[PDB]
Amino acid sequence: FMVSLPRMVYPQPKVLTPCRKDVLVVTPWLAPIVWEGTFNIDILNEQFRLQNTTIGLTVFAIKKYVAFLKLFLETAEKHFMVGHRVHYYVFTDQPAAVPRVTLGTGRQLSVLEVGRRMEMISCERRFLSEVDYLVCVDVDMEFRDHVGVEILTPLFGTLHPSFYGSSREAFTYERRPQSQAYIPKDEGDFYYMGAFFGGSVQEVQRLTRACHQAMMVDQANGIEAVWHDESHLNKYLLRHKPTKVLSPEYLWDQQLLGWPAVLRKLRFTAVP
Ligand SMILES: O=c1ccn([C@@H]2O[C@H](COP(=O)(O)OP(=O)(O)O)[C@@H](O)[C@H]2O)c(=O)[nH]1
Numbered sequence: 356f357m358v359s360l361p362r363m364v365y366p367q368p369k370v371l372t373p374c375r376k377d378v379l380v381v382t383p384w385l386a387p388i389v390w391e392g393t394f395n396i397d398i399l400n401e402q403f404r405l406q407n408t409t410i411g412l413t414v415f416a417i418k419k420y421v422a423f424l425k426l427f428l429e430t431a432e433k434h435f436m437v438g439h440r441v442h443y444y445v446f447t448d449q450p451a452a453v454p455r456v457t458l459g460t461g462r463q464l465s466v467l468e469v470g471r472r473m474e475m476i477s478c479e480r481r482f483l484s485e486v487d488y489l490v491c492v493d494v495d496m497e498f499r500d501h502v503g504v505e506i507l508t509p510l511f512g513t514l515h516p517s518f519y520g521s522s523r524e525a526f527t528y529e530r531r532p533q534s535q536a537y538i539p540k541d542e543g544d545f546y547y548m549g550a551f552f553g554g555s556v557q558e559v560q561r562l563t564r565a566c567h568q569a570m571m572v573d574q575a576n577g578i579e580a581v582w583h584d585e586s587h588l589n590k591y592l593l594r595h596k597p598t599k600v601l602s603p604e605y606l607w608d609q610q611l612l613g614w615p616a617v618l619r620k621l622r623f624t625a626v627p
């Protein structure tokens with residue numbers, strides 16, 4: 356049950372004036388594509404705060420990648436779901452190397468030692484009991500601007516920043532029919548990056564369970580998909596359409612791609 360929003364004063368949306376005329380803001384299966392200027396974050400924050408939403412953020416930091424955690428976590432404190440409850444789950448082979456990062460109120464961090472990403476996430480009962488949504492991201496990244504509850508939905512993928520302008524035949528999907536991740540050249544909506552996906556805990560466990568079963572089949576068969584778990588994530592999202600898609604504002608590399616006019620904010624970016 357969802358209680359009433361309170362009175363709020365904000366600019367009226369006008370039906371004969373689009374927010375953004377330069378980009379597609381809705382997929383053909385009526386999922387929003389989240390770009391700056393499409394959402395009123397005050398309305399969204401009220402909706403999700405009224406449900407006491409908790410967001411889990413999963414990050415893997417193995418071997419040398421523990422060095423990315425201080426910036427990743429300190430910038431998440433500045434820009435990720437600020438005002439909402441957050442639980443960070445850091446999977447690592449080096450628990451003593453996780454940096455001591457000061458968290459805002461209502462935010463917690465768990466260190467999970469590991470001796471894999473899809474298999475590790477599909478931890479199942481723990482996530483169901485502790486968070487409402489799960490967001491799964493790469494560690495070698497930093498938040499530069501707002502990443503908030505506008506992303507949240509049963510299932511989301513993020514447009515890969517190298518391919519958002521590309522035709523489908525150029526997408527680097529797995530093209531061998533011998534792979535569970537196979538997508539032919541006349542299929543595909545988008546090319547999604549393995550570096551930032553998420554959803555309700557239930558939909559994320561479905562996805563990661565399905566990807567993990569498909570990767571095991573491929574192994575048994577002596578085949579490894581061209582972009583590994585990302586190839587399987589794309590096949591999953593082709594056949595199970597995400598209920599939101601994040602624009603490349605949400606996964607960018609300024610060194611490689613600059614700051615084009617179509618991106619009004621660079622929110623979550625590669626660290627050189
Ligand atoms: O030795 C490694 C390699 C990878 N990763 C994790 O797996 C992610 C994917 O690897 P990477 O970022 O190198 O792939 P890329 O984005 O360069 O394609 C990294 O962000 C880390 O989260 C890690 O923890 N240790």
Ligand SMILES: OC[C@H]1O[C@@H](O)[C@H](O)[C@@H](O)[C@H]1O
Nearest residue numbers: 515517526527548549582585
């Ligand atoms: O073609 C797909 C690949 O694109 C590269 O830019 C990226 O670093 C890889 O992780 C993979 O996503």
Ligand SMILES: [Mn+2]
Nearest residue numbers: 493494495550
């Ligand atoms: Mn990465």
